[PDB]
């Protein structure tokens, strides 16, 4: 019978294919993250209710299409424990981030300074740290770490991202989103501090990715909450959410989600992204393929690469269900501007199309 590992590292094989990249380290770093997960029967049902994606598969795709080099693959995930839960899974992500820390040679100061920030023995919110696995063209692979602002409850998380910005010398620019880019008392009511994003190596600079989700929110409040950043086109930001969201102004299905880049010397955050649930707002793949291709062709990139991407995940007709394009995003500013795609592995269930 099919493990988990053979569906999942088939669909990381052909996607490396698709990006050229050589798939070894790739491939060893997914088993890696997979943990006990990887040898369990694919029949089995999910040992743990995962909140990487829908299906409760602990890992999610992505394409990143770039400017100026070839597209960027990336693994969103976390480790089980034996048996799951929310410290179990903890333990084990950040045992294998931290072995791979070692063997890469990494300094983890800058995670290491707001670690303690987040340590909680009763961890809320079925997350307490994911990762991503970075694999650009032609380059080592590169490592990132999603904390839960709310892993000590909701009410608690403006203290603690406000404390770890500050220790990290981003305490005068997160003002300035909390001040100027929050709908008025809506902080960890209708506009969710749900991750805090670190590169796991420390590098010259303190990329925090502070990500916001907007429930039920009108593209008017998200853009207005956008506008904090220097040089973001509200009218662009619209425009994505227009294309992606089909003709939805209110996102009342799976909510908008932005991220705020924070970088020393800066008087408010230095990027954005918009993150769109393109899954909840379509009849199905075929159709969330359609609104992707053309946010692609608009923006000036190759549909070849989207084309190829769905088609090394999986082989199903894009009509036959909705889900496996869960997301799509818009990247401005520094360090990598483009539009992202994310691909659900659909390891347990691919979710039923809705008649056209
Ligand atoms: N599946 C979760 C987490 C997640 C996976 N990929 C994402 C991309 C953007 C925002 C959230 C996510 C969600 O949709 O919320
Ligand atoms: C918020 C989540 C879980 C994922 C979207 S952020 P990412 O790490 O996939 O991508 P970028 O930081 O935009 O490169």
Same mark, same amino acid.
């Given at each position: 019978?099919?493990?988990?590992? @053979?569906?999942? @590292? ?39 209710? #995962? ?19 070839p597209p960027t693959l990336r693994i969103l995930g976390e480790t089980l424990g034996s048996p799951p839960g929310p410290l179990a899974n903890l333990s084990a992500t950040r045992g294998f981030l931290d072995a791979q820390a070692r063997r890469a040679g990494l300094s983890t100061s800058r995670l290491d300074s707001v670690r303690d920030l987040f340590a909680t023995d009763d961890p809320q919110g079925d997350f307490a740290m994911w990762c991503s696995l970075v ?123 932005? #991220? ?46 989207? @084309? ?35 691909? #659900? ?5 691919? #979710? ?5």
């Amino acid at each position: 019978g099919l493990s988990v590992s @053979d569906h999942l @590292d088939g669909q990381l094989a052909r996607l490396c294919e698709v990006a050229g990249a050589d798939p070894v380290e790739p491939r060893n770093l997914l088993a890696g993250l997979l943990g006990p997960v990887g040898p369990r029967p694919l029949y089995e049902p999910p040992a743990w209710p #995962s909140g990487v994606s829908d299906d409760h598969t602990p890992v999610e795709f992505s394409i990143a299409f770039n400017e100026a080099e070839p597209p960027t693959l990336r693994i969103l995930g976390e480790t089980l424990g034996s048996p799951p839960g929310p410290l179990a899974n903890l333990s084990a992500t950040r045992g294998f981030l931290d072995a791979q820390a070692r063997r890469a040679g990494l300094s983890t100061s800058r995670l290491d300074s707001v670690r303690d920030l987040f340590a909680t023995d009763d961890p809320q919110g079925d997350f307490a740290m994911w990762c991503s696995l970075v694999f650009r063209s032609s380059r080592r692979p590169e490592f990132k770490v999603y904390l839960n602002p709310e892993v000590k409850g909701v009410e608690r998380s403006p203290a603690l991202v406000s404390e770890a910005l500050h220790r990290l010398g981003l305490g005068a620019s997160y003002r300035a989103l909390l001040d100027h880019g929050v709908r008025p008392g809506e902080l960890g009511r209708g506009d969710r501090l749900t991750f805090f994003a670190v590169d796991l190596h420390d590098g010259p600079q303190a990329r925090v990715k502070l990500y916001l989700t907007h429930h039920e929110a009108e593209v008017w409040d998200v853009t207005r909450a956008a506008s904090v950043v220097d040089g973001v086109d509200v009218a662009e930001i619209e425009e994505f959410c227009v294309v992606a969201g089909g003709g939805t102004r209110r996102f009342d299905g799976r909510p908008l989600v932005g #991220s705020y880049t924070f970088t020393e010397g800066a008087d408010r955050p230095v990027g954005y992204s918009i993150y769109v649930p393109i899954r909840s707002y379509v009849t199905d793949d075929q159709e969330a393929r359609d609104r992707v291709a053309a946010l692609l062709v608009r923006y000036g990139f190759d549909t070849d690469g989207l @084309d190829r991407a769905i088609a090394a995940v999986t082989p199903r007709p894009l009509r036959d269900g909705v889900g496996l394009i869960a997301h799509v995003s818009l990247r401005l500013g520094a360090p990598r501007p483009g539009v992202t795609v994310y691909l #659900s592995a659909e390891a347990y269930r691919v #979710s039923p199309p809705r008649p056209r």
